[PDB]
Amino acid sequence: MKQIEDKIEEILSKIYHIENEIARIKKLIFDTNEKVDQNTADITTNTNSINQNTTDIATNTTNINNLSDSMKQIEDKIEEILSKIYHIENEIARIKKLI
Amino acid sequence: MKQIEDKIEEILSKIYHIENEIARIKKLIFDTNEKVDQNTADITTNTNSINQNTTDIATNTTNINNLSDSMKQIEDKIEEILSKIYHIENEIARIKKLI
Amino acid sequence: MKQIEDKIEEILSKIYHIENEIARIKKLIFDTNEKVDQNTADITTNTNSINQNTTDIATNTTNINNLSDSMKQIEDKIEEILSKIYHIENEIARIKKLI
Ligand SMILES: [Cl-]
Ligand SMILES: [Cl-]
């Protein structure tokens, strides 16, 4: 009756502490899940942005390639032009000798 | 003994409830970690993607600079071509007057 | 009463085991949060990389558009230059026939 009720006093006080710890734990878990859900939200955003960026890069890469082809064709024509202009200047110099 | 038995009955009931809470809490934790691990997997994919994209942007940026530099040369050459043509046109107009 | 003693010892053991389970649960929670906080740190790094990449893409996109514009203009100028040259060659042919 003195040790048994000592024992029950210990049991009930431990149970009450455990109840508190369970309450604190539930809160920790809630607070954790807020962080986790915020992370999932942020990840979803980033995933969408990466997708868009990957698409915009692909497009940019295609266009660069396109512009590169065009540039080569341009450089080609310009070399022809400069060569033709040189022929012309020499034609003119020959004509000026005959007048 | 009757009072102690009543106390034991309440104790056992509380302990039963605590055990259920704890089982519930464990489930919560493991479900939380399913999400956390999927988050981590998704971050990993995104990081790889961000890395590919960063490289691809670097390449595109270099190609753009190179095209921009070629373009500047081309524009100078067109300047030169146009002045040569203008000179030629003058020379031609003069020659036409002499013949 | 010897049963009562068995039962209290039973109870004390179960409470001991519950306390250990609580301690284990807390550890799980803090370990979970280490993963969560690392995820948060990694998401932040990725957000910053994405924001930079988005800007750089925009810059590149603008520059491609500007180069494309420039090249379209050069192509127009070449079209005209080539016309000026056909005409010049015609004139020169005419001059050659008159001298
Ligand atoms: Cl780009
Ligand atoms: Cl997370």
Side-chain angles (χ1 to χ4, degrees), chain A residues 56-57 60, chain B residues 56-57 60 64, chain C residues 56-57 60-61 64:
Chain A
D56 290 347
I57 289 145
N60 281 359
Chain B
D56 294 352
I57 290 157
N60 287 355
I64 288 147
Chain C
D56 295 352
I57 290 157
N60 279 2
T61 287
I64 284 142

Side-chain angles (χ1 to χ4, degrees), chain C residues 19-32:
Chain C
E19 290 173 324
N20 279 279
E21 203 73 345
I22 288 178
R24 267 152 216 160
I25 282 173
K26 281 160 99 168
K27 174 144 190 144
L28 278 181
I29 290 159
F30 292 114
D31 290 4
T32 293

